[PDB]
Amino acid sequence: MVDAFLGTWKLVDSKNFDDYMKSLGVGFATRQVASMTKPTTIIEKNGDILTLKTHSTFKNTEISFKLGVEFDETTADDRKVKSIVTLDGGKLVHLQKWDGQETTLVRELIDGKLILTLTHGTAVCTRTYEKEA
Numbered sequence: 001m002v003d004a005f006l007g008t009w010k011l012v013d014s015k016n017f018d019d020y021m022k023s024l025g026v027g028f029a030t031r032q033v034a035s036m037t038k039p040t041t042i043i044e045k046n047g048d049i050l051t052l053k054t055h056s057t058f059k060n061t062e063i064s065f066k067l068g069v070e071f072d073e074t075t076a077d078d079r080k081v082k083s084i085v086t087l088d089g090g091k092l093v094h095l096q097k098w099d100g101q102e103t104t105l106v107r108e109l110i111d112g113k114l115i116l117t118l119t120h121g122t123a124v125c126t127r128t129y130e131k132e133a
């Protein structure tokens with residue numbers, strides 16, 4: 001079910017990431033650096049367990065989870081959230097909850113590219129990743 005998402009992916013397009021970060025309360029200096037970073041995202045599985053790494057010259061993160069089972073997460077911007085990841089319409093949907101707030105991180109494959117849509121408040125960011133061999 002998750003298999004075409006697996007592998008190493010590199011950021012190749014970003015729209016409205018500053019808006020998204022600002023909505024989350026990320027400070028201006030972090031938003032500068034992040035606006036010029038191109039992370040590598042690595043998605044792997046081992047049985048029921050998925051591990052999602054995000055690597056860059058600025059922030060690195062790693063999470064492991066089972067689909068459909070809540071997990072604790074500390075995000076790149078230091079939010080402590082309650083998370084769940086699930087497949088919905090063939091999209092990998094990651095929902096984070098904290099302080100009564102929510103944000104969604106939705107991944108879908110379109111023409112072989114991985115499109116990540118980030119929504120918080122009214123801000124909608126679209127980031128495109130392409131697969132590394």
Ligand SMILES: CCCCCCCCCC(=O)O
Nearest residue numbers: 021026034054075076077127
């Ligand atoms: C430093 C800002 C962090 C915002 C939350 C994480 C954004 C992930 C973006 C991505 O994986 O392409």
